Copies of this chain bind each other. A is one copy, B any other.
Amino acid sequence: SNLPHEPEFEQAYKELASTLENSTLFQKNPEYRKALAVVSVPERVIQFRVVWEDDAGNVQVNRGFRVQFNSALGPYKGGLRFHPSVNLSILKFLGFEQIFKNALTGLNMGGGKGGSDFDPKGKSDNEIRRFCVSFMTELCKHIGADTDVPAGDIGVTGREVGFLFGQYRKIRNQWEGVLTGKGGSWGGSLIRPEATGYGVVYYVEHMIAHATNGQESFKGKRVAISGSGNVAQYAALKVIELGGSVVSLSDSQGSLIINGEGSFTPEEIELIAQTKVERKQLASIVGAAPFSDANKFKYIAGARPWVHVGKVDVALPSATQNEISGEEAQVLINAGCKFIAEGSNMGCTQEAIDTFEAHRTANAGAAAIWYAPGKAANAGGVAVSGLEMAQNSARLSWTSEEVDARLKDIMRDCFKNGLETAQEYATPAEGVLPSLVTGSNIAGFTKVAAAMKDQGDWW
């Protein structure tokens, strides 16, 4: 070996491997242990220096990455993250998860992830442009419409996708679906901005219907959300549309929580959206209307929302990895939370997951908190990216209604697959909800493992 310490990647791997072991999978297919050893080493990783010029004319250096983890099911597919935390460990955890998430969409997409330790905060739009130009000058050699199709993630919006696309087209002299999250007039898809957040809510709708035998829905439920970017914004919007209340949003500096009964409104979400476009914090808008209304809003510096929202019915962590601790998980259970789905990749700590899963095993039916992993619940974004690829390959643009209908079908099938797979391989006690994390992991892994075997990646 001897291998570097990659805690985030190791966490993701261990949770997958644990769920596979705690099932009948390896009794039925013990040869899949070999598949697991092979799939866990990325097919290819590219790391590269990115030199770029700041607004003062000074040289700056950052590190760029693209992890091309697995391509059995399709070209590598997954986002780009621009955040100062970024390193290979983080991108490997993300790319690894992406393989199995993509498998659950039913579309032909392999798994990858990339990005940079470039921090968009405090940069001008001009600085972001120059950075994206330099970044893509190297990345374009390694990607392409039938090769690897990136998109956004934390710190990468349609703005950055644009600058990246422009430079790709300039060097490669091809106009194609090399990126998704593109602008509406230059190959974007309707519903792509909404897709991840909408999908998370669609998925939880199925969880609620199943756990409650159709007796409950989002109507009248209180939903605590974290983050305030793309996933959080549209998850919030969909909750509101379905008659639920959104009782929190947050960012890296603090939480903005509804004080009492009430909800964010669509108009408030749009103000927050514009603030985040400008790369400003929630803290910067709580001094003026509407967010200075202390009757409606409480801003809590340095906090996550989970312990401050009081009673809640659904939690949708939608910011970043490891944002629900073991202690926070218990608080949510004590607050009456019965549904927790990850908008963020690896949003729950392992302690949180263990807490939720023990609770499910101990409490029959609708008394349990039911946990859905990000690879199932947040797959709507990448699914609609696949549809953007489909549109670009067709050279046509579909309607909002057409894309949204497909998104709904994909989320329904993903839920059913996880539910039915857990019922088959990890059969719960009578009256106990099946494990959606175990089911989703087995369903995604087996699809990839079998395609790998067919293609001679292992034998």
> Closest 9 CB pairs between A and B?
A166-B455, A162-B454, A45-B47, A166-B456, A390-B395, A41-B49, A75-B175, A163-B456, A146-B174
B48 touches A61 (CB 8 A): no
Contact partner of A42 (CB less than 8 A), chosen from B47, B59, B125, B166, is: B47
CB-CB contacts of A96-110 with B at 8 A, as 1s and 0s?
Answer: 000000000011101
What is the CB-to-nearest-CB distance from A276 to chain B, in angstroms, rounded to a whole number?
18
Contact partner of A393 (CB less than 8 A), chosen from B48, B171, B394, is: B394
Within 8 Å of chain B (Cβ to Cβ): is A284?
no
What is the CB-to-nearest-CB distance from A113 to chain B, in angstroms, rounded to a whole number?
14
Residues of chain B within 8 A of A48, CB atoms compared: 42-45
What is the CB-to-nearest-CB distance from A301 to chain B, in angstroms, rounded to a whole number?
23
B45 touches A186 (CB 8 A): no
Q: CA of A447 to CA of B85 in the docked complex: distance in angstroms?
A: 34
Residues of chain B within 8 A of A303, CB atoms compared: none
B5 touches A4 (CB 8 A): yes
Within 29-49 of A, Cβ neighbours of B (below 8 Å) are at 34, 37-38, 41-49
Residues of chain B within 8 A of A159, CB atoms compared: 454
Within 8 Å of chain B (Cβ to Cβ): is A450?
yes
B185 touches A457 (CB 8 A): no
B61 touches A185 (CB 8 A): no
A61 touches B73 (CB 8 A): no
B169 touches A71 (CB 8 A): yes
Known contacts A51-B457, A455-B165, A455-B186; A75 and B43 CB within 8 A of each other: no
Q: CA of A55 to CA of B459 in the docked complex: distance in angstroms?
A: 14
Give 12 pairs: A residue, B residue, CB < 8 Å, sorted on A.
Answer: A5-B5, A42-B47, A44-B46, A44-B48, A45-B47, A53-B126, A71-B169, A75-B175, A133-B456, A166-B457, A167-B456, A171-B171
Contact partner of A138 (CB less than 8 A), chosen from B5, B44, B57, B106, is: B44
Residues of chain B within 8 A of A126, CB atoms compared: 53, 57, 459
CB-CB contacts of A388-420 with B at 8 A, as 1s and 0s?
Answer: 011011111100000000000000000000000
Within 8 Å of chain B (Cβ to Cβ): is A63?
yes
What is the CB-to-nearest-CB distance from A72 to chain B, in angstroms, rounded to a whole number?
6
What is the CB-to-nearest-CB distance from A98 to chain B, in angstroms, rounded to a whole number?
15
Within 8 Å of chain B (Cβ to Cβ): is A132?
yes
Within 8 Å of chain B (Cβ to Cβ): is A27?
no
Contacts A4-B87, A51-B457, A125-B459 known; list 16 others, CB within 8 Å.
A2-B84, A4-B5, A5-B5, A38-B49, A44-B46, A47-B47, A107-B396, A137-B137, A147-B174, A162-B456, A163-B455, A165-B455, A166-B455, A166-B457, A169-B455, A186-B451
CB-CB contacts of A137-176 with B at 8 A, as 1s and 0s?
Answer: 1100100111100000000001100110111011101111
Contact partner of A174 (CB less than 8 A), chosen from B3, B75, B176, is: B75
Residues of chain B within 8 A of A108, CB atoms compared: 175, 186-187, 392, 395
B138 touches A170 (CB 8 A): yes
Residues of chain B within 8 A of A1, CB atoms compared: 84-85, 87, 117
B183 touches A454 (CB 8 A): yes
Contact partner of A175 (CB less than 8 A), chosen from B53, B129, B146, B166, is: B146
Known contacts A183-B454, A459-B125; A3 and B87 CB within 8 A of each other: yes
What is the CB-to-nearest-CB distance from A78 to chain B, in angstroms, rounded to a whole number?
14
Residues of chain B within 8 A of A458, CB atoms compared: 51, 59
Known contacts A59-B38, A454-B162, A457-B166; A175 and B49 CB within 8 A of each other: no
CB-CB contacts of A52-69 with B at 8 A, as 1s and 0s?
Answer: 010101010101000000
Within 8 Å of chain B (Cβ to Cβ): is A422?
no
Most chain B CB within a 10 A radius of its CB, from A42, A162, A392: A162
CB-CB contacts of A1-29 with B at 8 A, as 1s and 0s?
Answer: 11111100000000000000000000000
Within 8 Å of chain B (Cβ to Cβ): is A382?
no
